[PDB]
Amino acid sequence: YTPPSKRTWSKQHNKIFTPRPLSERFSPHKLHPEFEWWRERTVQPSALFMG
Amino acid sequence: ACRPGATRMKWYFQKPYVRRVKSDFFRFPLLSQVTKQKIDWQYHHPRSGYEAACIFGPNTLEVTNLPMGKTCEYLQERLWRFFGKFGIVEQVRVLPHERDPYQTCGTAYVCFRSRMASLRAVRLPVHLPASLHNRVLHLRHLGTDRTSDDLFYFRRQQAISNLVAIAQQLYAYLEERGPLPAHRALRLLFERSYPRLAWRQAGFSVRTCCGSWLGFFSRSPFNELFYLARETDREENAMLEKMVIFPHLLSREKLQALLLRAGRLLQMDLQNELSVHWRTDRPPLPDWTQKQIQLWQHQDPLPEELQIWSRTKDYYKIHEERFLFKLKLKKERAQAKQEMKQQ
Amino acid sequence: FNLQSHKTKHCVRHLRRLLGRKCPSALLVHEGTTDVNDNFRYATAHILAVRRENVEGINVYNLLKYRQLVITEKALLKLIYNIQTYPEKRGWLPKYATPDGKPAPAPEKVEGWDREWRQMKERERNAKFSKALLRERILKWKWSDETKGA
Amino acid sequence: QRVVQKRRHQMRILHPAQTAYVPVEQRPPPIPHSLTASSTVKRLLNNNTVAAKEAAKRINWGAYISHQRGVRWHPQGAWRVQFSRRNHERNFFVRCECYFRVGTYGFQMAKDLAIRYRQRLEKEWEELQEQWTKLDILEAEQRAKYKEK
Amino acid sequence: RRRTGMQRKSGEIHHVAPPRDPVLRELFAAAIQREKDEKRNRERRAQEDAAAAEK
Amino acid sequence: SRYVKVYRKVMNLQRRKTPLPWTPTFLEFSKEPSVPFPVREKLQPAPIDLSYYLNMEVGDLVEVLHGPDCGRQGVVLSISKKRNTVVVDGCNMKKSFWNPGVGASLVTQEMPIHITNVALLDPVVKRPTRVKRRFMMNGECVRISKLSGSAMPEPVSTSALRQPNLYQEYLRQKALGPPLKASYARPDPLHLKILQRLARHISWGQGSPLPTAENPRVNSPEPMALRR
Amino acid sequence: KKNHSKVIQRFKLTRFGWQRLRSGRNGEKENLTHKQLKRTMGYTFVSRDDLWKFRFQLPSHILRLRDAPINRNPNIRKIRRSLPSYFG
Amino acid sequence: AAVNRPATRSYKRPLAHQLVELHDLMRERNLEQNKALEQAVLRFVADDGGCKRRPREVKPLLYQRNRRYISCPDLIPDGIEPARPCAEALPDVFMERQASLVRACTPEDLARQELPFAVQAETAYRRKRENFRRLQRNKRF
RNA sequence: CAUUGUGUUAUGGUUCUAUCGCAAACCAUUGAGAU
RNA sequence: UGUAACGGUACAAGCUGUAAACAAAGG
RNA sequence: UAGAUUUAUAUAAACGGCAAAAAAAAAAAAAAA
RNA sequence: UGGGAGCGAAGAUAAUCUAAUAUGUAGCUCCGUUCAUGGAAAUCAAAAGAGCUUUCACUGAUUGUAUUUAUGAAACGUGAAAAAAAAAAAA
RNA sequence: AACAGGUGCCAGGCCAACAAGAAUCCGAUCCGUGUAUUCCGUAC
RNA sequence: CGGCGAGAAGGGAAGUGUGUUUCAAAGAA
RNA sequence: CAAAACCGGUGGUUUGUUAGUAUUUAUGUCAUCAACAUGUCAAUGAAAUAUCAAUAACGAUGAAACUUAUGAUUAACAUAACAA
RNA sequence: AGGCGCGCAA
């Protein structure tokens, strides 16, 4: 067991969370298969009114 | 290890934006003077900078330069505490960062109860301590366009340097020509304006650091250099028109120490007006209210009874007799000291 | 080992002149800076029967592996110095706790420093009161239970 | 911790016996070690008693001493004559194991005959060495003469 | 590359550039011409020996 | 647990660039042979240069897709084909160090972003796109974006993109070593030239006495001489 | 190495051997004489038969046994004084 | 010793004028030929007082098996070939050359044996110094 | 000391391995480029 | 990304996509 | 990088409440991952 | 992932058995590994001092916990590796 | 002697586009990158 | 031939004899 | 007391001559799951761009063949030939 | 840096 610290005692749920990419640890210099770079995405409409 | 809570915050150094090709708007778009960010005509709407006025009413200030590494709620509480000095604050809001809702983008809005309170609040910028990245918050009133005076601190530092130079000049003049009348001596003293240091008649540093020449002479340590002697603005002029300034005969070391002391005291005067206390002219607060105020910044230590369970069995005997007796003796000593304080 | 030509053939001829035509292998020892030059390093780079080493890398293994040892005078003196001063570096020799590190003069003994001990030995040498002296010693002295010291 | 056990006796640390050096101009030769293989001498040495110590003084140990290399006493009851040589170049290996028995000849007569035997063996060895050197020189002469052709 | 490429008789070869100083440049040219002259001497001797053997 | 230490040791052995250089010293022998090598699986997919197939070149405008720079747009400054990495202007500002030149105490600069974490931007819609190379009859090449069918603008020129790489200058200075003493670094050309003349005499004089006012004669050096 | 924290507590290593207290020190002693009580509250040495246990229970504390020298050379025996020379 | 030290803030080094003045003093006392002084001058000049700096370079002791080839002509005067040995092979050291390798000792040999290591090192240094020679070309006669 | 055995030789029975491969590290070179 | 189903190809543990092994000589 | 390049691999996540059918009116409705 | 987080066993040792060991291990779910973990003292220590954090060796299988089995990269400290604090009031 | 590949098997000089031997003698039945002797190239 | 002194939180910890020592529960690569 | 680099391109070394090799289905099971089948892509040979001629014999090529060449290889085990 | 040993005689 690692006792918490000033920067580490607060945590979020693994699945119900507010996404904050600025603070989430990431390694941009590596390939991430989870993002499926090979797979093309669909460009959705940027504005919708009444669906 | 796990997903980060609001205790873990990160930010990164911002590269200054340079339009390397001035004509290439696709890759080097113009910055907006309102939002201070790249123009995105495809996916953004023009902002006049007065939108928050329609939300928070005319008595609103926009605050800019708020730091990183702080929760929007913590900053809201701190700004409310600061701006309560000028009146009743209806609301304080701090805009979150685009990439981290737990941190601020650097902008806030303060809505006051009274126009006069908001106008009084807008006059001076807000200097923050090191824990807030030493930032100087800039204030802008949405109903009158009035802005804070972001150069106040450095202009006052220049004024203090000018005052020290004036004292040295006057002492040299007295040492050369001997005692001199006030209305003739004062015209030989000059200051250097801010920030480019152009020579000027010395009348502004005196009134920004002391309020008048009589205040300058009567306030320490300049009364240890000079001695005024009898042979509103009208009273000041008449009173000075019938005086002679005499020097206090000092050595070089004593005079240098006095000049340094004057500089330090004026610096303290400058810091006081920026660190005026937030409880000034306000009612006392109960102990519970003070504890609630403290909790915004610090958490109380966890109970020692819960803490004892952290003593690992590998090296400790949990709930050990000598350790618990030591705790009891410490508690007794603390209670005895508190009783002594009470008596 | 300074050469004015980089050609392998000239160095081969020099080696053959020095060691003959029947030399199995050679170890060439030099200091590195002013004892040998890049021409020599180029010339020897394709003579599979010879191996270049600096003084720091000399071993019983190298000396046994390579039949001949060809050493410059500078490298030989460097090796001799290293060998002769190694015991001092490793601390296998006595020190003298003086600023110069050399031995200090041995003082003279104070006269009569052992006269009482000599007299006590002379008294005890009669040896006829053996049990009495033994009992005196038993009363006076005590064996220690510690493992270090007296 | 490597503690060496020590023994104490009469308030002293007990040590194995140890004697000093007594210079001698000419140490006399030892009594032969072969005597220690006899039952009588073995018992004399193994019994630390007054009778043994008196028999030791009564025994004439000087009669067993041989003043000749290669001649000495054997528990057989005889004088052993030894002479060992190995010559690989000439393929000649000699090991003399001669015995002159007291029962056959007599103590002193057997001793004398053994000494004479050893002396003769030495003389013959010297003469053989000389002859071998001569023959080797002759062989070299023959090989050179053959190579002349 | 000998692991994944074609077979090649010669490895990577570099020929030293001439020195800039004119004196050393002349000496270098002399050395190169000497190499060439030795090769040509070998070739001419071979031809002469072949002709003599033929006759 | 009593295995974490040895596990960390054996895992660092996987990253160690063994053998490392080792300076010989008298009667010392290297431990490099005793150090084991990292273990890897050698049967893997072959190397590829994804920039070639993606038609991404220095000077193109791209968007960072994931990480603390998500949604940021910048011009590509450098492409590493072996690493399949890209340097994007004003993104991944991770490398900070003491300033090697003039200005503030610290300077920070970008670090490579893997090419898969980045995407080309359509000139009309300004969203991630795919770019294909088409060829006209004359052989002129045109890069076309999938989303709008627009031609890609010509990449920004190296002259406009150029910026000094201060981290490499910092590395060079660090390799040189700590700052010199001011007194040692002060130039002394006259005494240095005197010492250089003395050094010439020392190195190439063959042990002849130095010139003096009494006998300033020039001693002729001996040649090596042929054996006869 | 590893030592036995329980075994170590009952013994003391000295220059003359391992030492130990005596069982019956903390027991019923009303019926002992004064001599027996003195011996009971004194100490003694671990018997040679029990030393092999230490080799494995207390590896870091070694007592190097030293018995008397056993030298069978006939020349060092008292009877050598009755001989004119040594045996060799 | 000091000229080899780095020129950083924590080291003590002689300055250029200090070296020149020391050389002048030894010259006045007829010690300008001092081995240590000469080597100090050489090492100081090599680095220009430690101001020109480069990463530590190691002169190779081994080369890779299939290294590249640098082609350069023999930069040697004409008519020059390496010297040839006398005869084919020298007599066997053990079988026939025993007498030539042993000689009766003399007091001069004992004195040479007793000479000190500093003298031996100075002898070697000066020998290399004197024997640093080269072959001349036609235009240098 | 067999034509129901043995000695010797022969023929069968019999294990199956033909590099379709070789940095992500380091060394040395060389363009562009910075100083 | 990787893999596979069918189809074409010497009806195949290879290659390959209905343009299924080849365009390099266009206003 | 001359072109072409079928089908399956349940994908609005280049994205944000969780929760069947990659995301379902409020509530019922429940959770160590 | 013998790295980090959550939950969390038995076969085995204790010559049965309990604690403790196995072990905070296996399985299950979640991070995704030097661009990381962590972190610039309301710290540790003695009445002298050290100076964020991190890695290695020693101190030492010592002082400890378990009290039939075993566990224990303890603390201070010593010798090394690496070295950093904080560009930043606006422009 | 790791002066790599290929050539009928063990080749620095036969091929391999940039160095150097169709070298000589001896080989049960074919060949020899083999034995013995010798020359040459090599900053490979 | 050095003079009454340059804004150091009234809080945490350390034996319970705290006269003393140390720190500030408040900030960046 | 001696001595004093970054991004492309091109090769080489080490990992690794000392270590190992892993991609396709025949066969089992309701399923989880299990599991080195069948020598080698390859007649033999260095070469088939040496298998020609031919009812048969002598011939052809080859170092070796209508065959110890038109698949090789122990023991146990199978069959024969010769011998007193 | 550290580890073991360091006469009981004179």
XYZ file of C-alpha atoms in Angstrom, chain D residues 27-144:
118
model
C 75.063 -31.981 14.879
C 75.744 -35.747 15.120
C 73.821 -38.025 12.759
C 70.413 -39.315 13.870
C 69.722 -42.858 14.973
C 68.043 -44.489 11.944
C 64.273 -44.129 11.716
C 64.099 -47.787 10.649
C 64.522 -48.813 14.299
C 61.082 -47.378 15.100
C 59.493 -50.176 13.031
C 60.670 -52.838 15.509
C 58.176 -54.028 18.112
C 60.591 -53.641 21.028
C 61.574 -50.076 20.115
C 57.966 -49.177 19.306
C 56.842 -50.348 22.751
C 59.786 -48.559 24.375
C 58.703 -45.300 22.729
C 54.974 -45.819 23.371
C 55.405 -46.632 27.096
C 56.299 -43.461 29.029
C 57.528 -45.309 32.110
C 60.590 -45.638 34.322
C 61.421 -49.105 32.980
C 61.279 -47.839 29.395
C 63.441 -44.828 30.256
C 66.050 -47.093 31.879
C 66.071 -49.563 28.983
C 66.592 -46.595 26.656
C 69.769 -45.650 28.528
C 70.903 -49.288 28.556
C 70.421 -49.681 24.776
C 73.510 -49.054 22.616
C 71.910 -46.874 19.948
C 75.277 -45.988 18.396
C 75.832 -49.413 16.837
C 72.933 -48.902 14.396
C 74.313 -45.639 12.976
C 75.719 -46.006 9.463
C 78.406 -43.550 8.345
C 77.796 -44.477 4.688
C 75.234 -43.110 2.254
C 73.185 -45.972 0.840
C 73.836 -48.335 3.774
C 71.585 -48.470 6.818
C 69.570 -50.670 9.176
C 66.355 -52.540 8.403
C 63.855 -54.126 10.832
C 64.694 -57.362 8.987
C 67.733 -57.769 11.193
C 70.068 -56.940 8.329
C 72.008 -54.110 6.728
C 70.269 -52.727 3.641
C 72.403 -51.565 0.705
C 70.587 -49.290 -1.749
C 71.743 -47.721 -5.013
C 69.324 -46.188 -7.513
C 70.064 -44.745 -10.952
C 68.015 -43.978 -14.067
C 69.615 -43.428 -17.494
C 66.942 -42.987 -20.159
C 69.378 -42.265 -22.997
C 71.135 -45.621 -22.502
C 68.009 -47.449 -21.237
C 69.695 -48.524 -17.997
C 67.815 -48.498 -14.681
C 69.478 -49.802 -11.512
C 67.858 -50.392 -8.111
C 69.974 -52.311 -5.600
C 68.080 -53.935 -2.716
C 70.896 -55.933 -1.156
C 70.622 -57.316 2.382
C 73.495 -58.453 4.605
C 71.816 -60.406 7.387
C 73.078 -60.469 10.968
C 72.028 -64.102 11.291
C 74.044 -64.993 8.190
C 77.249 -63.003 8.776
C 77.182 -61.161 12.105
C 76.210 -57.625 13.052
C 79.591 -55.985 12.453
C 80.715 -58.256 9.607
C 77.410 -57.722 7.798
C 77.794 -53.963 8.274
C 81.315 -54.023 6.820
C 80.295 -56.140 3.830
C 77.340 -53.841 3.124
C 79.592 -50.769 3.202
C 82.046 -52.426 0.808
C 79.151 -53.374 -1.487
C 77.937 -49.772 -1.666
C 81.460 -48.479 -2.326
C 81.963 -50.936 -5.190
C 78.610 -49.944 -6.683
C 79.666 -46.284 -6.647
C 82.988 -47.096 -8.324
C 81.306 -49.153 -11.046
C 78.819 -46.347 -11.674
C 81.644 -43.842 -12.172
C 83.467 -46.136 -14.598
C 80.236 -46.746 -16.521
C 79.625 -42.999 -16.836
C 83.115 -42.547 -18.283
C 82.572 -45.407 -20.740
C 79.222 -43.951 -21.817
C 80.807 -40.574 -22.557
C 83.508 -42.282 -24.629
C 80.951 -44.326 -26.573
C 78.862 -41.216 -27.216
C 81.869 -39.390 -28.663
C 82.547 -42.415 -30.870
C 78.919 -42.403 -32.046
C 79.187 -38.728 -32.979
C 82.363 -39.516 -34.920
C 80.575 -42.309 -36.797
C 77.614 -40.078 -37.657
C 79.911 -37.332 -38.956
